Amino acid sequence: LTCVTSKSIFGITTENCPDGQNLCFKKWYYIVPRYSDITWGCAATCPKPTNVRETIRCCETDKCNE
């Protein structure tokens, strides 16, 4: 399984995930109305928002987390 792990206006980077990590994630962390930090990666289980600023989505196919 191949996930996005970083993105810019110039393109994406991807990784082929560790064995046993069969989900891709995208995670938004809200900082101010105009701006949110966003991270992307492989995961074993769908990360749980531990903060109210956090929004996560997960999926199971190649590069699905863009």
Curated annotation (Swiss-Prot):
Gene3D superfamilies attached to this UniProt entry: CD59 (2.10.60.10)
Cellular component terms (Gene Ontology): extracellular region
InterPro entries cross-referenced by the UniProt entry: Snake_3FTx, Snake_toxin-like_sf, Snake_toxin_con_site, Toxin_cobra-type
Disulphide connectivity of cysteines: 3-24, 17-42, 46-58, 59-64
GO molecular function, one term: toxin activity
The UniProt record lists the keyword Secreted: yes
PROSITE patterns xref list: SNAKE_TOXIN (PS00272)
Expression (tissue specificity): Expressed by the venom gland.
Keywords: Disulfide bond, G-protein coupled acetylcholine receptor impairing toxin, G-protein coupled receptor impairing toxin, Neurotoxin, Postsynaptic neurotoxin, Secreted, Toxin
Compartment(s) where it occurs, according to its Swiss-Prot or TrEMBL record: Secreted
Role summary: Shows a non-competitive interaction with adrenergic and muscarinic receptors. Binds to alpha-2b (ADRA2B) (IC(50)=2.3 nM), alpha-1a (ADRA1A), alpha-1b (ADRA1B), and alpha-2c (ADRA2C) adrenergic receptors. Reversibly binds to M1 (CHRM1) muscarinic acetylcholine receptors, probably by interacting with the orthosteric site. Also reveals a slightly weaker effect at M3 (CHRM3) and M4 (CHRM4) receptors. The order of potency is ADRA2B>>CHRM1>ADRA1A>ADRA1B>ADRA2C/CHRM4.
Family, as annotated: Belongs to the three-finger toxin family. Short-chain subfamily. Aminergic toxin sub-subfamily.
Remarks, miscellaneous: Negative results: does not show interaction with adrenergic receptors (ADRA1D, ADRA2A, ADRB1, ADRB2), dopaminergic receptors (DRD1, DRD2, DRD3, DRD4, DRD5), histaminic receptors (HRH1, HRH3, HRH4) and serotoninergic receptors (HTR1A, HTR2A, HTR2B, HTR2C, HTR5A, HTR6, HTR7). Does not show interaction with muscarinic receptors (CHRM2, CHRM3, CHRM5).
Protein name: Muscarinic toxin 1
Source organism: Dendroaspis angusticeps (Eastern green mamba)
